[PDB]
Design a protein around this ligand. Structure first.
Ligand SMILES: OC[C@H]1O[C@@H](O[C@H]2[C@H](O)[C@H](O)[C@H](O[C@H]3[C@H](O)[C@H](O)[C@H](O[C@H]4[C@H](O)[C@H](O)[C@H](O[C@H]5[C@H](O)[C@H](O)[C@H](O)O[C@@H]5CO)O[C@@H]4CO)O[C@@H]3CO)O[C@@H]2CO)[C@@H](O)[C@@H](O)[C@@H]1O
Length: 141
């Protein structure tokens, strides 16, 4: 039942080791351990964390987020040039923990957090972890 838990981002102030930002339409900054996305109005901006070597398969994504507007979570396979919409998350003025199943049928090497409405609403992310297992089985490590 045991999963493998990949800690991508926790209490950092820069990009994760082995990840690039393939984002668009935004400024990325940090404060107090949170990644802060400042999207430009009209650009539908996003951070896109690109894993430089290897890929994840299925499993689940866990993260804390607060967000002024609706945020779309996607994964992508850069080799196939395919993207997959995981969930759109409603606004919250406080951090909330999300644990989302990833049902994409390909491996993924990009994880995206996008300003879905394109109004420039800011996004804060902490504590980003992938599990090889399901969201229902995720034991938050
Ligand atoms: O960084 C160097 C690296 O870049 C490589 O090229 C990358 C490029 O940098 C970007 O990462 C690009 O990313 C694109 C995504 O793959 C995906 O296609 C994405 O699709 C967006 C779309 O553009 C738009 O924002 C859309 O907004 C919706 C919104 O979500 C909502 O539904 C609203 O109602 O409507 C709007 C408008 O339709 O949302 C889509 C999903 O997120 O667009 C990204 C930006 O273009 O990928 C490139 C690779 O293909 C290479 O140059 C590489 O060599 C280099 O090293």
């Amino acid at each position: 039942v045991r999963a493998t838990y990949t800690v991508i981002f926790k209490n950092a102030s820069g990009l994760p080791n082995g990840y690039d930002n393939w984002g668009w339409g935004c400024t990325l900054s940090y404060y107090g351990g949170a990644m802060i996305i400042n999207p430009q109005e009209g650009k539908y901006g996003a951070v896109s964390l690109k894993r430089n070597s290897g890929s994840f398969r299925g499993g689940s994504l866990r993260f804390d987020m607060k967000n002024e507007g609706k945020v779309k979570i996607l994964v992508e396979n850069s080799e196939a040039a395919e993207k997959f919409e995981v969930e759109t998350i409603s606004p919250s003025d406080e951090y909330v923990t999300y644990i989302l199943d990833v049902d994409f049928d390909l491996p993924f090497d990009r994880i995206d957090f996008q300003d879905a409405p394109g109004n420039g609403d800011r996004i804060w992310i902490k504590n980003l972890v992938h599990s090889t297992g399901s969201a229902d089985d995720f034991v938050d490590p």
